Amino acid sequence: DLCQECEDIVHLLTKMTKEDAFQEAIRKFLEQECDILPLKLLVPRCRQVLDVYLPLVIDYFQSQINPKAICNHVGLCPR
């Protein structure tokens, strides 16, 4: 049941993004990855992209989202 597993992942992400520890951990991990391969080459200006977009993703998962619509958008739930 892909739809339900995707919805569960979305729910878990909504829970995890509420903790500052989560943001700090993912920030440090991605900052380390941005300085080495593969990301260093695959994503130009990796660190700046990270600085700008990690807070936006955190906010997004803390906002009023529609899990079934999200999972439909990526093709894992029907409409």
Ligand X SMILES: CCCCCC/C=C\CCCCCCCC(=O)OC[C@H](COP(=O)(O)OCCN)OC(=O)CCCCCCC/C=C\CCCCCCCC
Q: Which residues bind ligand X (CB under 6 A)?
A: 6, 9-10, 13, 26, 30, 33, 37-39, 41-43, 46, 49-50, 53-54, 56-57, 60, 65, 69-70, 73-74
Min separation Cβ 34 and a copy of itself, Å: 12
**Contact predicate 5/78, CB 8 Å:** no
- Residue 37 as a binder of a copy of itself (CB under 8 A): the answer is no
Determine, following the binding rule CB under 8 A, whether residue 42 of this chain makes contact with a copy of itself.
Answer: yes
Identify the three-state secondary structure at position 6: helix
Q: Are 68 and 77 in contact (CB under 8 A)?
A: yes
Tell me which DSSP letter residue 78 carries: -
DSSP string, 13-35: HHHHTT-HHHHHHHHHHHHHHHT
Can you give the binding site for a copy of itself, defined by CB under 8 A?
A: 2, 5-6, 8-9, 12-13, 15-16, 19, 21-22, 24-26, 28-29, 38, 42-44, 49, 53, 73-76
